[PDB]
Amino acid sequence: SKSGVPRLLTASERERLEPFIDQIHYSPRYADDEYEYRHVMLPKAMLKAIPTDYFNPETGTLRILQEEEWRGLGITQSLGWEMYEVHVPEPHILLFKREKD
Amino acid sequence: SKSGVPRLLTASERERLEPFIDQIHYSPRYADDEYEYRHVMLPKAMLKAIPTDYFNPETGTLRILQEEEWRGLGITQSLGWEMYEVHVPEPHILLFKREKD
């Protein structure tokens, strides 16, 4: 399997994101025992302006970006945050659950 | 949006699943505060024998099956289990987390 290499945006690429930056939404933080979480919602129009190599072709979503990469997109947050993704099981794996009594 | 209707397998459809039934793997159960969980792994060859209307075309995975539907596929478990799916965020939503100190 071959995967994309992390890469910083060029001046022209970054300039293209300007009209969307002020429209980025940051959710309030929520947490569990050992982690804090939050999600960032980009305007849908912004995705068409992001370089294709920033996307995972298999998932259709953005690949896990390193800090320099997401900050480079115009996403601003405090320190410590790391991007993560939900992992969906392959089609041959089924998930079940039942209430405990 | 239009979605698939639950539907039981016909005699011929069910007969086609026979060579795979004994190869289905059931994971041990794990749990949290209010739920028990487990995952079932079907042999990959079995997916090609399952009716196309049992799949979600948007996800590529099986749609949430009702009890009669999954038991009808040859999946045998005790009582209480309900099929569930992981929900992946749309491409414009990014997830972040950081360790609490």
Side-chain angles (χ1 to χ4, degrees):
Chain A
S1 38
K2 312 197 186 320
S3 48
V5 179
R7 192 268 299 191
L8 293 178
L9 300 180
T10 62
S12 50
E13 290 176 328
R14 181 56 180 76
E15 207 65 29
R16 285 185 260 274
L17 301 179
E18 284 291 276
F20 313 104
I21 306 305
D22 60 299
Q23 299 297 304
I24 294 177
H25 167 81
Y26 300 86
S27 77
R29 308 172 310 164
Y30 38 100
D32 58 25
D33 316 279
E34 54 174 296
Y35 288 96
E36 277 196 84
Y37 307 83
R38 83 114 54 78
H39 51 271
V40 176
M41 296 183 35
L42 313 175
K44 297 175 182 176
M46 182 173 169
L47 298 177
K48 301 173 176 59
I50 292 175
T52 47
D53 60 303
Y54 263 49
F55 290 89
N56 179 331
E58 297 189 304
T59 56
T61 61
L62 285 175
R63 56 181 182 76
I64 299 297
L65 305 170
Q66 299 183 174
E67 189 173 20
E68 273 297 274
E69 300 187 282
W70 57 257
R71 292 195 181 270
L73 285 181
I75 302 173
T76 304
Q77 306 189 88
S78 44
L79 311 181
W81 303 101
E82 288 186 39
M83 192 177 163
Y84 78 94
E85 63 186 347
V86 183
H87 296 299
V88 159
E90 295 177 77
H92 69 290
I93 303 174
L94 313 190
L95 311 176
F96 293 91
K97 69 182 176 181
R98 66 171 174 190
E99 307 198 75
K100 297 175 65 176
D101 260 295
Chain B
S1 38
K2 312 197 186 320
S3 48
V5 179
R7 192 268 299 191
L8 293 178
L9 300 180
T10 62
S12 50
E13 290 176 328
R14 181 56 180 76
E15 207 65 29
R16 285 185 260 274
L17 301 179
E18 284 291 276
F20 313 104
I21 306 305
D22 60 299
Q23 299 297 304
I24 294 177
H25 167 81
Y26 300 86
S27 77
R29 308 172 310 164
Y30 38 100
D32 58 25
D33 316 279
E34 54 174 296
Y35 288 96
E36 277 196 84
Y37 307 83
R38 83 114 54 78
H39 51 271
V40 176
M41 296 183 35
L42 313 175
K44 297 175 182 176
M46 182 173 169
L47 298 177
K48 301 173 176 59
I50 292 175
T52 47
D53 60 303
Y54 263 49
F55 290 89
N56 179 331
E58 297 189 304
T59 56
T61 61
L62 285 175
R63 56 181 182 76
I64 299 297
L65 305 170
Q66 299 183 174
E67 189 173 20
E68 273 297 274
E69 300 187 282
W70 57 257
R71 292 195 181 270
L73 285 181
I75 302 173
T76 304
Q77 306 189 88
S78 44
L79 311 181
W81 303 101
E82 288 186 39
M83 192 177 163
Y84 78 94
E85 63 186 347
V86 183
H87 296 299
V88 159
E90 295 177 77
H92 69 290
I93 303 174
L94 313 190
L95 311 176
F96 293 91
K97 69 182 176 181
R98 66 171 174 190
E99 307 198 75
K100 297 175 65 176
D101 260 295

